[PDB]
C-alpha cells in the first residue's frame, strides 16, 4: 500500500543497506545538480546510518570537487572534515540537506520522483524547457488547464527538474532489482538520514524516559494515595 | 489563623547561629508550610508546571547559546552544528522549542482556571496584573526567539509583527526603524533579539517572585467562594508534603507525555518552511506565524471593512483611525480588557460553580478561543471572515458587558459554607 | 533655602539621568553603515520583454517588468473611479493622478510609456513581496501574506493594502540601463 | 531598639489597599530607614559605588551584546563596528572596560576597610563568606570577558589560565578539554565564555541581595568595637536622607574622575597588544594578563625551586605534588585563608583603631598587596623572585599566625564606649 | 622638541589639512604594501577628519582594486560602502587600521619612518634583504652587534620594510615643503584618525560630563553640609 | 512500608535527576567535529636548512627546524645529568633516555639524525609558544609567558616548565615531505 519505510514508527533504526543503496544513487545521479552543504562527509562512518569504512570515505572525498580554503586561498584536496559540495545555479537546484523536513516528508520525495508521466489530454504540447509532474504542487500550470478562477485541474504541476531515472540506471553491488521504485525509496531514506541522523537515539531516549517517568509517577501516586488516606476514608 | 509557625529556631546550635541570615526561617515558615485548603482539584497544579518549564527553558537556552552564533551567515549552520555534532543537541533544541509550546498551553489552563473560580475577583488583583505583565513578556520572548534560527518563517513573521508598530501614524516608522536597527530586517535585528531573548527570562523570574509573594500573602483561591476562616482552622492542610507530592505526580505525567512528543512527534508543532534558509526576495504560502498568537493575529486581520458589522467605515469619521490602526488597537484591547476584568465583574460573589449563566458564557468563551486559534491559519476568504468577526465580537462582549449584567442578576444558587467540605 | 536647594538637586539629578539615558536609546537607531542607502544601475539588457526583472537594493526588491499588451489595455482601461489609491505613489513626479500615462515610466530618453514599469516590490500593507507573473483576480500581483490584489499598473485592489506600489526615482541611461537612486 | 517603624499603613486608602502586596512596607521599614550609627567615616561608601558600577556594567553589556558577534572571524570586526558606526560606541566600550577596573579597585577598598574595622569578626561571618563567593564570581566573569574581543592577549591569557586546571594530575586534562570545548582554544571557548559572561552578573546581583539582607539583619560595623546599644538609641540616625546623600556625593566625585579617565586616559589601563588580531602561532612579549590578577599570578609563578626557602624540594616528598600544583594550591589557599580569617583571629576585641601592633602588620599587608601587584608584571629573573617569595610568605603568615598571637597579647588600649562619640 | 601633534592634549580636534596630506601620501606610498580593511571608504566624508567631497570619494573608490562580492562571485566596482583593500603577503606588511594603538603610538610611527640610516660601525655589511631602522625593536640583530648574553648593542634593529620616502617624493597641492619629516607627521596623524576617528567627540563628551558632574557634586556637598549641620555645631 | 516506600521514591527522583543532569555536563565535551583530530603533510621543500619551519595543526604549531652545527654540538654535548626531563617526550618511540641520538628525528628513510628535529611548539608549563631563532641563555627557545629556557634539542631548562618539548608521531615521505599524524 502506502509503502511505509522502516523508520516510520516507534522503532525502525534506519536499515543501513537501504542507505548505502541511496548513497550509490545520490552520488551518481542527484549530485549532478543538487548538494548537501549541511552534511559533513565523516558522517558516513558515524553509527545509525551507513557505517561505511573510513578509508573509502577519505577516497570518495578526495575524488570530489575542490573546496579551496578558509585561511589561504588555494585549491585543496577536500578532506572529509569539509562538507559535501554545493550546486548553486545555471540549471541547478536547491540543497537536499533538510528537504525531508521542509515538506509526511520522504513520502513527498518518493511520490515526486515517482511521477513524471507525459503531458495529459488538456495540454499535450506542454511547455518548452519545463517538464510535468503529478505531485509537485508549487509549479506553473497552462491557462488551458486552469478552471474559471485560476485553480488548476491537474493533480500536480510543471517542475523544472527532469526525470532523474530510467528503467535500470545503475547496478547494486549487493544484488537487487534496481528498478525506479526501489531507487526512489532508497534515496528518500538517504535524504531522511541526511536530515535526521540522530533518529534512533531519539527513539531510545524516548523509551528510557517514558519508562523512568512512568515509574516515578506510579510511586508518587502511591505516596499521594497514602498521605491523603485519613482524609478520604469515611466518605 | 494564618499559623506561620516560624519554628522558633529551637532545633539546635546550627538553627541558632542561623540567626545571622534568616533564610531557612523564610522557607519553612512561609514557602513550604503555607496552609492550603483541602478542596483543591487537579487544576491547581499548572503553576508548578510553569515554574519547572521556565527553569527547563532557561537551562536549555543557556546551553544552546554555547553553540548558537547570532549572524545571518552562521545561525542556520550553528543550529545544524547543534543538531548533529554536539552531544545532546537535538534533545536541547526539541526540548527548548516544544517546551515553549507546553509553557503557553499551561499558562492558558492556568488563566482559564482563574476566570472560572473568581481568582481575579478581589482581593487578588495584584496577582492578575502581574500575570498579564508576565504573559506579555513571555509572548515577546517567544517571538524574539522564533527568529534566531534565521529560517524562512522567522524573517517574515518578524517583518509583519514589526510592520504593526509602523502602522500607527506619526511615530510608526520611527519606532519600526529603532526596533529593527534599520529600514528592514538584517543582522542588527538578530543581535537585538538574541540579547533581549537571553535577558527577559530573568525579569520573568523576578515577576514570578512577586507573583509567588502575592498569593502567599493572599490566600489561594479554593474551589469555592470561601476563605480559610482565619480565627484553629482545622481545614487548610499545609503545602508540604501533601500538595507538593500531588503536583509532582501530575508533573511527572506531563513530562512523560512531553518527552514522548519530543521523541516521536517533535516536528509536529513546527513549520517545515523554517528548515529552509531565508530569501528576502521570495515569500512562502501561509506564513502562519505560530499557534500561540493565532487568536490575536485573527483579531487583527478580521477588521477590514468587509461586513455589514464593519465598524471601520464608522471609525473612518476621524481620518487618522484607519483599518490597520484599528486592528492593532483591537488586539491591545483584547488583552487590556482581560487585565481590567477584576473591575468589570460587578458581582459580590465568587466561583462560577454557583453561577450557571456564567458557566454557559464561559464555555462559549473557551470555544471562541479554540475557534480563533483555528481561524488565524485559514485564509481571509469567505466564510472565515464572518467567523473571525463574530468570535472577536464575542470576546469583547463577554469581557465588557456580560460580566456586569451577571453581577446584577446572577444569584440563583446556594453558596457553600465551611470550606471543610466533608461530603 | 530648604525648598530651592532640595528641588534643584533633584532637578540636576534628573537632567543628568536623562542625558545618560538618551544614548542607550540612540544606539539602536540606524548606524552610519546603514546611513549610506545609495543607488544601483541595473541593465535591462534584453531579458525577453514581458515576463519580469527583480533586483536587490536597500534590502528590498525593485521590480522591473516589461509590458504585455493585454496587461497594458487592462491598465489603460481603468478609470480613476473605483481605484483605492489614485495618487500615483511614484516619487519621480508630483502627486498627479494615478494614471497609466504618468504611472508607467519615463520613455527611454524617447517618447513612449506603455512598455516598462519599475516599482518597489513591497506590499504597502506590512511589507511582504507579492507574487508576480500574472496572478490574482486582476491579472497583476497577489500578496500571499493577507490577500491583497494588485492590478497591472500596480495600483492596490481587493484587499487591506491601502495604497498602490510606489515608484522610486529612476531615469534611463540611453536605452539599455536603469538608474535606481 | 532596632526601630523598624513599619509606618502602620496609616497614610491613606492607597497605603491601605497595598495590604495585598507589602512591597512598600519592606522598602520603608527596612531598606531606607535602617538605623545607622553617626560615627561613619568616608570608607562606608564603596558599597554604593559597587552597586552602581554593577548596574552600569550590566547595562553597557546588554547594549554591546546587540552588536558583538561571538565568533573568531567576526568578533574584532564587530568591536570596530561598535567603536566606529554605532551611536555611542566608544563610550559604552570604554565605560564597560574601565568600569571593571573601578569595580575591582572599589572591592579592594571595600575589603581592606573590612579587615581593619573587624567586619569579619563575629557576628558578621555570613557577609564575609558571601563576599568571597562574589569576588570569585566576578574574577571569573572579568576573565571570561577579556577574551571576547579575540585580540592577542585574550588568546594567551585564556591559554595559561586554563592550563592551570590542567596542571593537577589525573583530572587535569579532562577538565581542561571540558572547559575549552576541545584540546585548545577556538570558537567553542568563545561561545561558552560569552554565554557565561552574559549570565553570572545576575547571580552576583542575587548574592548582593543576600549580601544586603545579611548586614541589614546584622548591624553595620562602625569605626568602633561597639554596637548600636539596642535597649531609645539616641544614636543611630537613619539611612535616608543623611547617608544616602553622603554616599551620592562621594559617588558623584568618583564618576567625575571615572569619566575624565574615560575621555582622556581610556587606553591607559589596557594592553595595546589586544588591538592586534590573534595569531596562535606567535606569542608577544610580556603577556601580563591584567592588573587585578597580578597578585595571584605572582603567588603562582613564585614557587619554582629557586631559593633556599624553596618548599617545593620538600613537597617533592610525595611524587604527585610537583611545582605547578603547588603554586595552584598556594593561590587557592591565598583566597581560602582570607575567607577563613573570622575563625583565625582569636581576639575578643574589634577595630584595630585600638590595636597598634595590628595597625603595623596591616599596613605591611597593604604594602605587600601593592608589591605583588607591581611584581606580577616584571620577569622572574633575580631579584624579583626573592621579592615575590617574601611577599607571598608574609601574606600567608599574616593570615595564619599573626592574628592568633595578637588575639592573645594585643590589648594595650582603652576601648571606647557610648557609640555616641560627641567629641 | 618632541614635535607634539595637535590632538596631544585635552583639545586638538585633528587639524584636517594635515590629514589630507597624510592621505595623499598613504594612497601613493604606503598603499603599495599596506592596507586598512578596518576602514570604510565613506569615512572620508564623516566629520572630525578629512571632510572630503563625496564625489571624489566615489571616484577614488572606483579607482582602487576589485573587491568581488559576498553573494554572487563577480568582480564589482568596489563601492565606497566596502572597505579599503588588503595587502596580505609576498613582500607585504600588516594592516595599519589600528597600528596607532597597538604600540605613545603615533610617535612610534614618526620616529620609526624617521630613521633608516646606514648600517653602523659594528656590522657595516649588514644583511641581504633586510634593512636597518633606529627605532624598531622587534627585529633581528647580527651576532656581531649582540653583547655577551644575547642583548643587542644597537638602538633599534633590522626591519623588513624598505625606506619609504626620499627628499621630495610627492607634491602638496596646498603648497608646503614636502620633506620627509612633514610627510611622516602627516601620515602618523592620518593613521591615528584611521584608528581613533571619534576622538573629538570623546573630548567634548568628557568636558560636558566633567562639568555636569562637578555641578551635581557641589550641590550634593551643600545638601550634606546642611543636613549634617545640627550634629556638627557644638564641636 | 512507610520507610521503604518513602526512601524508594526519593531514590528514584534522585536517579532521574542525575540522568537528566549528566548530558548538561556532557554537551560541553569535545563534539564529533572536534573528534576528527587527524593528519597533515608538510613539505620541507628546501626552506634553507637551519632557520626554522612552522605549520598549523590541531590548533597548535608544529615546529620543523633544520640543525646548525653549533646548535648540534651543543646538543650532543649534554650529559643526562643536570637535565630536568630525561624522558625524550617524543611519542614515536618508547621512554628511551632524552638523548639527541633518539631525540632528533628519523633519518629521511636513510641513516642520519643530527640534521632535523620536529617537535610540538607548545610550552609544557601552560601552553605558550616559545620564541625561536636562537634565543634564551642556552641557544635554543625562550618562553616569554614566564621565562622558561629550552635547549637546542628542546629539553626544558632554566624555568618552571617541567618537561621538554614533546615530539609527535612523524615519519618521512622519501626525502621531501613530513607526515604529521
Ligand atoms: C538536474 C539535471 C537535476 C538532477 C539530476 C536532479 N535534480 Fe532535483 N531539482 C532540479 C531542479 C532544477 C529543481 C527545482 C524544480 C522547480 O520546479 O523548482 C529540483 C527540485 C527537486 C526537489 C524539490 C521539489 C520541490 O517540491 O520543491 C527534490 C525533492 C528533488 N529535486 C529531488 C531530486 C533527487 C532525489 C534527485 C536524484 C535522484 C534529483 N532531484 C536530481 C534539478 C535536478
Ligand atoms: C613595501 C615596499 C612597503 C611599503 C611601501 C611600506 N611598508 Fe610598512 N612594512 C612593510 C613590511 C614588509 C613591514 C614588516 C616589517 C617587519 O620587520 O616585520 C612593514 C612594517 C611597518 C610598520 C610596523 C612596524 C612595527 O613596529 O611592526 C609600520 C608602522 C609601517 N610599516 C609603516 C609604513 C608607512 C607609514 C608606509 C607609507 C609611508 C609604509 N610602511 C610603506 C612593507 C612596506
Ligand atoms: C540562555 C538563552 C535562552 C533562554 C533563557 C531562552 N531561550 Fe529560547 N532560544 C535560545 C536560542 C539559542 C535559540 C536558537 C536555537 C533554537 O532555535 O533552538 C532559541 C530559540 C527559541 C525559539 C525558536 C525555537 C526554534 O528552534 O525555532 C523559541 C520559540 C524560544 N526560543 C522561546 C523561548 C522562551 C518562551 C523562553 C523563556 C521564556 C526561552 N526561549 C528561553 C536561547 C534561549
Ligand atoms: C494572567 C494571569 C497569570 C499568569 C500568566 C500566570 N499566573 Fe500564576 N496565578 C494567577 C492567579 C490569578 C493565581 C491564583 C492566585 C490565588 O489563588 O491566590 C495564580 C496562582 C499561581 C500559583 C499558586 C496556585 C496555582 O495555581 O498553582 C503558582 C505556583 C503560580 N501562579 C505560578 C505561575 C508561574 C510560574 C507563571 C509564569 C511563568 C504564572 N503563574 C503565570 C495568574 C497568573
Ligand atoms: C550583557 C552583557 C554583559 C554584561 C552583563 C557584562 N559584560 Fe563584560 N563584556 C560584554 C561584551 C559584549 C564584551 C565584548 C565587548 C567589549 O570588549 O567591550 C565584554 C567584555 C568585557 C571585558 C573586556 C573589555 C575589552 O574591551 O577588552 C571585561 C574586562 C569585562 N567584559 C568585564 C565585565 C564584568 C566584570 C562584568 C560584571 C561583573 C561585565 N563585564 C558585565 C558584555 C557584558
Ligand atoms: C570579600 C568581602 C566582600 C565583598 C567582595 C563585597 N562585600 Fe560588601 N560588605 C562586606 C562586609 C564585611 C561588609 C560590612 C557589613 C557590616 O558592616 O555589617 C560589607 C558591607 C556592604 C554594604 C553596606 C556598608 C558598606 O560598606 O557600604 C554594602 C552596600 C555592600 N557591602 C555592597 C557590596 C556590593 C554591591 C558588592 C559587590 C558587587 C560587595 N559589597 C562586595 C564584604 C564584602
Ligand atoms: S503584507 Fe502585503 S497584504 Fe498583508
Ligand atoms: S607558559 Fe611557557 S613558560 Fe609559562
Author numbering:
A (entry chain D), E (entry chain Q): 5 to 107, 126 to 257
B (entry chain C), D (entry chain P): 2 to 232, 237 to 428
C (entry chain E), F (entry chain R): 11 to 191
Please share excerpts from the published article on this structure:
When similar analyses were carried out without imposing C2 symmetry, three distinct maps were obtained for CIII2 (CIII2 c-c, CIII2 b-c, and CIII2 b-b at 3.8, 4.2, and 3.5 Å resolutions, respectively). These maps were superimposable with respect to cyt b and cyt c1 subunits, except for the FeS-ED portions. The CIII2 structures depicted by the CIII2 b-b and CIII2 c-c maps exhibited overall C2 symmetry, but in the former the FeS-EDs were located in b, whereas in the latter in c position. To better define the clusters of cyt domain of cy, the docking analyses were repeated using the three different conformers of native CIII2 (CIII2 b-b, c-c, and b-c). However, when the FeS-EDs are in b position (CIII2 b-b), such models were more spread out. In CIII2CIV both FeS-EDs being in the b position, we assumed that cyt domain of cy docks similarly to that seen with CIII2 b-b and that spreading of docking originates from the variable conformations of the FeS-EDs in SC.
